Amino acid sequence: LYPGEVCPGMDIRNNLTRLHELENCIEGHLQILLMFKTRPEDFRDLSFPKLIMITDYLLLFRVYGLESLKDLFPNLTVIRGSRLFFNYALVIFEMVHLKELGLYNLMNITRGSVRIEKNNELCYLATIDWSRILRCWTHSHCQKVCPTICKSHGCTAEGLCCHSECLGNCSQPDDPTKCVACRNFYLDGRCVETCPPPYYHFQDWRCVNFSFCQDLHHKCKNSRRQGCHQYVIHNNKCIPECPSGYTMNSSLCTPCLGPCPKVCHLLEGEKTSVTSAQELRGCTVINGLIINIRGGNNLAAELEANLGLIEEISGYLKIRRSYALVSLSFFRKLRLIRGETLEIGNYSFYALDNQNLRLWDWSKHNLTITQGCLSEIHKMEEVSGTKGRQERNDNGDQASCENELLKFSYIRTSFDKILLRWEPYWPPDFRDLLGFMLFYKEAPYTVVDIDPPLRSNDPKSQNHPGWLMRGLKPWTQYAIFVKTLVTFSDERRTYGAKSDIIYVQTDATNPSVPLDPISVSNSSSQIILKWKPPSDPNGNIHYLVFWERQAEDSELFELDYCTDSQILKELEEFRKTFEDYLHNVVFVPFEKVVNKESLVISGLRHFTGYRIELQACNQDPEERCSVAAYVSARTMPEAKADDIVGPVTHEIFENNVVHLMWQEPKEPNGLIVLYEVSYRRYGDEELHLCVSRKHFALERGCRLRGLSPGNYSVRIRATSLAGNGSWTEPTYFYVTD
Amino acid sequence: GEVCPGMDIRNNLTRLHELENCSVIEGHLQILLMFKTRPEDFRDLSFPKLIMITDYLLLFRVYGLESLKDLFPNLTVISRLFFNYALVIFEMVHLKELGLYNLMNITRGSVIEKNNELCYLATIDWSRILDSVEDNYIVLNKDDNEECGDICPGTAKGKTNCPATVINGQFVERCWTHSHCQKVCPTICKSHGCTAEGLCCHSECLGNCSQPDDPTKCVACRNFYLDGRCVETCPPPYFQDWRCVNFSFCQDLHHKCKNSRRQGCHQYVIHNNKCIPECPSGYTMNSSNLLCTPCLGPCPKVCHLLEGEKTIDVTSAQELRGCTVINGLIINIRGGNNLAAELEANLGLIEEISGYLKIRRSYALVSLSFFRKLRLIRGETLEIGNYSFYALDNQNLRQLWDWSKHNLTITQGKLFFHYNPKLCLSEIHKMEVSGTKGRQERNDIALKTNGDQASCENELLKFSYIRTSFDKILLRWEPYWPPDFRDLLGFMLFYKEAPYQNVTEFDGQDACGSNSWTVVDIDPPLRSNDPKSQNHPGWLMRGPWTQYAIFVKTLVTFSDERRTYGAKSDIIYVQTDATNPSVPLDPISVSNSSSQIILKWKPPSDPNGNIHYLVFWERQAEDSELFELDYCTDSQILKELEESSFRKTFEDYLHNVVFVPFEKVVNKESLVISGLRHFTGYRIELQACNQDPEERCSVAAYVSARTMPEAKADDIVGPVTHEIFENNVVHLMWQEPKEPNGLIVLYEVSYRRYGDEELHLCVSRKHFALERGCRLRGLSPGNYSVRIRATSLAGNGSWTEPTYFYVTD
Amino acid sequence: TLCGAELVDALQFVCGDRGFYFNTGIVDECCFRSCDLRRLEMYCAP
Amino acid sequence: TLCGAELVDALQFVCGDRGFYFNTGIVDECCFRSCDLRRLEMYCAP
Amino acid sequence: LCGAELVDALQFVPQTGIVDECCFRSCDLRRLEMYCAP
Amino acid sequence: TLCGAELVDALQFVCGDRGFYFNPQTGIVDECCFRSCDLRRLEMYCAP
C-alpha cells in the first residue's frame, strides 16, 4: 500500500526550516544542499517516516552536523530513476559528519547508478552490496538481502516472498494492494501490472485516469511562464510528449498524415551526461552533437535506446576524447547530416583520440554527408562519398584494413597453435614486399611480421610464406587474416593483397577440475557432492566422481584416555638501401553427472570417512577426464551404533571384590575407545570409573575393590569417537559386612 | 711505378692485366660481375706492384676468386669513397679470406656484406687501420654464423708467431689468411709482441715491423713516410697521407691528367706541404710549380651533383665534403650510432645549400647543430608542399639549431616537422630569427606528434632543503599549485647515481626493465586556504660516500584549452658525510727475525673515499701444560589520466549543478715491528681508520706471529758436576740455560763405559726438579764417560764437556 | 584562480548566512579564468 | 619484377657471356615497377 | 640499524598509533610531518 | 655430426607437418656437431 501523499521534487539549502515540508509526503528527487551553517542539534529533532517511495534520485551535499541518515528516511524503499543524475540515482557528498547510512528499508534501483564519495566522516562502505539494489547498513541496521526465490518482489520476516506485482517489499505478501512498492504500476488501491486501460501509464510506475494528466495539461495551458509539460495519452500510456510520427488535434497522440519528424533545437546550438542523451532521446532532427563519454563504461547501448530514433543532425558531429566508445553503429536511424554548421577546418565530422572504437557495418549502411584504419576512410571515401567534392587533408591495433581478397593454401589447428600457409601474392615487382603481416585475435563471438621468403624462379615449389599462430584457448574460436605491405610507387598503383577473415576453432583438450566442490553429508548413508562448471577446462564438456572408504586412526585403537630497441630493429634492416643504392652503380564406486553440478553418493557407512575424487570429462572410447581433486567427508553418526544390548553380568566375592562383564557393541561408531562404569550406593552419592580398551582386555571386564558393605547399583556406558552409547540396564548387588 | 688512374673491371679478366705495370691507382679500383670465370683464371695473375688506392677498392659478385692475397699482395694503403668503406667486398660466392695484409691504414673510411663463403672478417682489429670503427659493421656473411675453424699461424704448433689482441672483453689471437696475420696492433707500441719477428713498433710507424727504434725497419708508418723511412711530418722537398713525395711527384701526378683525358682521375696539387688532390676553398691554380694559392677572386667551393640529390646514407658527405656550397640534401642514416662527428667533419664546411634539406627516418645521430656554418638554405629545389626544410620520422632528435647565436636565413620554401617524438616544442617555437614566422604560408608543424617521449617543460622549481648527514638523505622542495590545483597529479622524482657531471635528461633506457634512472611518485600535499604555511612535500633515500644526483619532475594531465606544461627541477649533486671504516682487508703478520714481525694488509674497499692504519702488538702467554707434562606502461597511463580527468569533470559538474703498544702508517700497508723475544707469540690488532679531530677506526683484524728461536741459547755451559756413593749411586748436577727458547722440557744423559757401548737416559723437568739432578743406580764397577744435552720446546741444545767417574770394584 | 574545493570555502566567504541563490558553467568563470568578487557574490541568495 | 640478388640472377640470364655495360636510375626502374626482359637487355653489353 | 634510521626519519620529519598506519598504507613524508607537528 | 641445413632437413623429415624451429647456435646444431641426436629430443626443437 501507499499510506501517504505525493510531492513534486525539491531542493533545500538555507537551514533546517524548509525540510519540515517533508513530514507528511516524491514525483522526483530530494536535494539537501549547502547545509553548512547549522549543527548536529538541528538535524537531531527531525525525521521523515512517511517517505516510502521516491522516483528519480536522492542527493545530500554540503551538509554539516548530521551524523547519519538513520531516522531521516526510516521507511523509504525503492528508487526507479526515470531521470538520473549523471548515470547516478543517489549522491551524498562532502559529509564532514555523516557516519553511516541508515537506509535499511532500501530495496531497488531500477535505472542508473549511485555515486557516494569524498566524505571524511562516512563509513560502512564495504558492508553494503550494490548487486541487489541496482552486510549491513549501520551499527543498528543490516542489509535486507531478499532471497532470489523472491527475485525482485521482496521478502518478509518469516522469509515469505512478496506479491509478483510487489517490488522490494510488501506490507502484506502476495497482495498487490499491500505492496510497499509496485513491480510495474499502481492503481488507487492496488499495485497492477500494466494499467488497466482507463488508468493509462504514468512515469512507468503509476496508473492514472484522464484526470491526472488532464489537470496537468490545464496547468500547462494556463501557465505562460513555467516550463511544465503537456502530457498526452497514447499506447495506453500518459506520456510527457508524443513521440515522432504522431501529432495533436487538441481535442490522444494521433498519427501524422505527412512526415513529422521531431526536431530538437537545443540552446547554445552546441551540446556536450546520460542525462543529456535522456532529453534528446526520441529526437529525430537535432537542430544543432558531441561524444565525450569518458570512463570507458559500456553506455552507448543505453544510448542506443536514445539515439536509435535520431534521423538528421543540424550540426557537426565530433567524437572527441571519446575514451569509452566502441562503435558508431548506434546511429542506426541517422540518415544525412544537414549542411547547417561545420567545425574549424570544415570538419563537420571530427574524430579525435578514441579509445575502444572497434564504424558502421557499411555493407548495409547508406548514411550521407552534405558538407565538411585507412580502410574505413576509403570505405567512406567511395561508399559514403567524401571524394571529389572535397580535396585531401581529410595509427593503432586491430583496425580492419583494406587491400584485395586473398586466401590460405593450408590451415591447421589442433590444440593451441595454428599453421597458416597461403599463395605468395608477389606484387607486379615482388621487391615491393616489405614483408607480410599476419593478423589474428580472439573471436569468442595480434600481428606477426614475416620477412618475404626467398623467392625461387619457375612455377615450381617455392616454400610458400606462412606462419604459426601461437595463441589460442583450446576451445575458443579465432579470426585470422593477412594483409601485405607493398612499397608505394610513383607511377604504378600497388595496394598489395589482403586475405579474407577466416574463423578457426581449435579442438578441445582434457578438461580441468570443477570449481567449488563441497562434500556435505546429507545423511548417515548419503553425501551430496556439489561443484561448479569450471572455466579452466578449455574445451567442450559430464563430471566423474569416485568415493573410497577410509580407515580410522590406528593410534585410537591403543591410546588410553582414562623501449626503443624495436625502432632500432625496424630501422637497421643496410639490407634495404646499401644494396639498392649500389645497384645504381653496379648496373649503370563412481558416478558421472551430465549438465548438473550435484551428486548424491550413496552406499556409505554411518561413521566411516570417505575420500572422494572428482574430475571433469569432455567425452565418455578413452577417457580424457580432468585432473583429480580429493576431498574428505564424514557421514552423520548413528546413536544406535554404540548401544549395548542386555544387562551387565557380575560376580561377587566375600573380600569386597566385584567382577563385571559386559558385551562389546558389535558395530559401534567406527571404534569405541573406553567405557564408563557408574555405581551408586543405596541412599548415597554416585561414583564413576573409566575402563579403557587395554584395561578391559587385561581385566576381562572390570574389578571393583574396597566396596563398602550394603546394596549397590551399577550401569555401563560405552564411549566412541562420535560420542557415547546408551546406558546399560542397572544391576543390583550386595557387599557383605 | 706508374700512377694508373682509377678503373672498373667486369665479367672478363683480360682488362685486369692493365694493373700489372702500375704501382699506384689515381682513384678507385672496382672488380665486379665476374660471372662465368673460374679460379684457374685468377690464381695465375698477381699484382704486387700496386701500392696505393686513393678513392675506394671494391669487389662484388666475383665468381672463381678465393682471396686478394695474390691479387693485391702489396696494396699498402687506401679521398673519394664508395659508400662508407675503403674495402667493400660484397656478395662473394667463392671468396674466403680478405688477403689485404699489406693494407695497413685507412685513416678516412672503413671496411663485408652477404659474402656466403668469405670468412676471417671480425678477426681483424680495425681500430688502427681505420679511424673510427663506429662506421664499421660486419653483417650477414659466412662468418656471420660461426662455422669457421679460425686457426691462426703458430696456434696449431702452440707458438705465438702472430700478435694477439683484446676487444669486447675477449683476448684472442688474430690473423688475416692463416698464413699471414695482422698489420694493425701496436699503434704507439700497444700490443705488438712479435709483429714481423719478435719486436714492437714505435709510434710514428704503424703496425708490423722488424725493429721499433729504427723507422726504416718499421714496414708501416702512422702519420708520414719519407722515401725510405717514416717521418713525424713530411720534409720540405718531399703525399695524400702516410707518405712524402717530392714537389715533382705531385707535378708528375698533375701532368698525368693534364696530358691524359680520363673521366675519374684527378689533378693532384700541392698545398700546405701536402700533395692534396685539390686546392682548398678560396684557392686556385696558375700552373707554375702547382702550389695552391689564394687570390682576390674569393669564390666558394661548390659541389655540382649529377644525381640532383646526394641522398645521404659517409661518401655522400665526402663527395660533398670540401664544398662550401652544395648545388643541390636528404639524410636517412640509421643504426643509432653517433656518426655525427664524421658528418660535421664533412658537412661543417657547408655554408650554402642551393636545394632544400630533408631528414627522414633518421636514427643514428643525436644533434642537428653539426651544420656549424650552414647559415643558408637557398631552397632552389623543394619537396612536395614546398618545404625548404623537412623533418619526418625523426626518432632520435633532441635539439635543433640553438638560436641563441645562430642566424640562419631561408631564401625560399617552408619547413616540415612531423612525427618528432623526441623533439622539444620549444625548439619549434624557437625557429619561427629565421624570419619564417610571416612570409606567404604557414605549414611547418604537426602539433600532437612532436614531443611524444621527450618534451619541453618550462617551469623550474627552486629546490630548498637537503640533508645528507648520514647514509640517508631528506629532500624538501617548493610546493607548486597549477592554475587548477587538481591538474598536478603528483611529482615524478628522478635520480640516479652520477659518478661524473655529464648527466642529461635520458642517459639511456632499457626496454627489459633495466632502466638506469630511479623514479618515485609523490602524491601532492594537502593545502590550506591561507598561503602563509604550505606543507612542503619531501622524500627520503632508500640507502653512502659515493656521489648522488637528483632532478625533480611533475605529472600533469593535459587539457585542450589549458596551458598546462608541468614543472621541472635541475640535476643537483650531493654527497653524504663520513661513515665507519672497514677492517683492514685481510692482514697477516709473519715474524721476520728472532726479534721482528713484519705485518701487511690491504685497503678495504667497503668504505670508499679518503683514507691511517693502526697496528697493536700484544704478547701471548705461554701454555701452562708445557710446564707440567712429562716428556720422557602507457596502457595504464592512458587509463589513469582518463579517470583523473573524469574525477575533475565530475567534481566541477557537481559544482555547476549545485551553484546558482701500537704503530700507525698512512696509506702504506706494510710495517716492521722490532724488540721481540726469540720464541714467543705476538698478537697484532689491525684497525683501519678512515678518519684521523678524533680518528675513526673500524673493527679490528687479529693476526699473530711467533719469532724464530735460537737453538744455541739452550746450551749448557761447563761440565757436569758429579758425586759417587759406595752403593753404586752416581749423582749429576748441571746448569739451567739463562735464556731458553720458550721453556726447556727435558735433558738427555749419555754414558759409556771404557771399552763398552753407549746408553741414554731421559730426565724430564719434573724428574730434574724432584731429583735435583739425575741419579744413576746399579752401575757396574769401572770407568765411565758421561755427557748431558739440554732440550727445549724449540729444539735441542749442545752437548756439555765429558765427565769421567769411577766405580770401585 | 580558485578551483575546486576552494570554491565551497570561497563562496561561503561571499555567501554566509544569506545562503545560496537558486531557482556556461561556474567552474569556467572560477577555474578556467580568474574570478573576481562580483561573480562569487552573485551566486549567493540576494 | 625481381628482387635484389635474384634481379642479377636473371639479368645475367638476360646478359650471359655478353659482359656488362661499363663506363631515376635502376631503383626507379627495376624495384617499384615491373622489370621485363627487353629492358634488362639494355643493361647487358650490346 | 634499520629501526634506527626509521626513528631518525620519524623525528626529523613507533607505537600502535602509527605502526598500523604504516602497515596499512605505504610510506609518506607528509605522514612523518603530520604525526610530529602536534 | 651434421651441418645446420642437413640437421634441419632431417628433423623436418622426422616431424612431417610440425615444421622447423632452428636452435642461437647453442641448441640442436651444437649438440649434433658434438654428439649424436635421437627422436626423443626433437619435441623441444619442433616449430611451435
Side-chain angles (χ1 to χ4, degrees), chain A residues 86-348:
Chain A
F86 196 108
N87 196 4
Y88 310 136
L90 186 67
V91 175
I92 305 167
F93 185 99
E94 192 44 72
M95 294 298 102
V96 179
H97 312 67
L98 271 290
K99 302 159 187 184
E100 56 194 3
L101 317 181
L103 274 295
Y104 39 89
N105 284 324
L106 194 82
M107 286 321 132
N108 192 6
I109 309 307
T110 314
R111 172 211 190 170
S113 301
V114 172
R115 170 77 69 99
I116 301 278
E117 66 182 1
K118 186 76 164 58
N119 312 295
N120 210 3
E121 204 74 23
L122 204 62
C123 276
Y124 290 88
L125 278 179
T127 180
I128 190 64
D129 285 327
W130 280 114
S131 186
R132 201 255 296 169
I133 297 169
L134 74 163
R135 304 311 186 167
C136 63
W137 296 101
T138 63
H139 53 70
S140 301
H141 315 103
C142 283
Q143 198 181 4
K144 187 185 142 270
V145 176
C146 275
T148 184
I149 187 63
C150 315
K151 205 146 45 189
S152 51
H153 311 289
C155 57
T156 69
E158 291 86 358
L160 304 175
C161 302
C162 286
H163 189 255
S164 67
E165 191 34 47
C166 281
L167 202 54
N169 211 351
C170 48
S171 62
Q172 195 269 327
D174 300 332
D175 194 336
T177 78
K178 290 297 181 174
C179 293
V180 167
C182 307
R183 201 202 169 284
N184 282 7
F185 280 95
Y186 177 75
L187 188 46
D188 286 329
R190 184 187 208 91
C191 288
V192 286
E193 297 312 304
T194 183
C195 277
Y199 278 68
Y200 311 102
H201 310 74
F202 195 66
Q203 275 72 11
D204 206 4
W205 75 273
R206 212 182 186 180
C207 298
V208 296
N209 63 83
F210 310 88
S211 299
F212 287 73
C213 328
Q214 134 236 290
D215 283 317
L216 291 167
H217 186 273
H218 292 90
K219 296 150 198 176
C220 283
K221 189 184 179 181
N222 294 352
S223 300
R224 306 283 176 158
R225 291 288 296 173
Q226 176 53 255
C228 69
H229 299 88
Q230 291 82 0
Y231 287 63
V232 191
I233 305 166
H234 163 271
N235 191 25
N236 286 320
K237 306 180 183 186
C238 168
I239 299 305
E241 178 65 27
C242 309
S244 187
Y246 309 131
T247 180
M248 289 332 305
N249 50 357
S250 73
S251 308
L252 270 292
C253 314
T254 67
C256 55
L257 168 64
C260 296
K262 188 269 183 181
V263 72
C264 296
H265 179 30
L266 60 85
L267 73 165
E268 306 299 323
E270 283 190 31
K271 172 167 68 186
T272 177
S273 56
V274 66
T275 309
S276 301
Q278 192 270 330
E279 292 84 4
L280 67 91
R281 176 185 179 176
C283 294
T284 55
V285 184
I286 297 309
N287 210 20
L289 198 61
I290 307 172
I291 297 169
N292 305 337
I293 294 90
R294 324 291 292 264
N297 283 111
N298 200 13
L299 309 184
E302 182 295 339
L303 191 152
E304 187 159 340
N306 305 274
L307 277 296
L309 304 177
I310 196 55
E311 300 166 355
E312 295 207 14
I313 59 173
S314 192
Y316 64 92
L317 156 69
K318 82 206 205 181
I319 296 89
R320 220 170 65 160
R321 294 73 45 95
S322 309
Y323 168 97
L325 281 193
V326 174
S327 170
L328 274 296
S329 47
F330 53 70
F331 282 98
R332 208 159 318 287
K333 295 299 295 296
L334 180 82
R335 178 63 191 94
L336 161 58
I337 55 176
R338 287 175 62 90
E340 301 297 328
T341 313
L342 315 180
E343 202 204 355
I344 174 63
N346 312 273
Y347 310 149
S348 192

Side-chain angles (χ1 to χ4, degrees), chain A residues 410 412 417 419 468 470, chain F residues 17-19 21 47-48:
Chain A
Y410 182 76
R412 179 179 57 92
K417 66 180 72 65
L419 183 60
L468 273 154
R470 320 285 157 114
Chain F
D17 303 344
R18 280 309 307 268
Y21 182 76

Side-chain angles (χ1 to χ4, degrees), chain B residues 94-108:
Chain B
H94 294 145
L95 281 72
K96 196 176 177 296
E97 285 90 6
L98 301 186
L100 278 185
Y101 53 91
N102 198 14
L103 173 60
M104 46 197 204
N105 197 7
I106 311 159
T107 315
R108 167 194 279 284

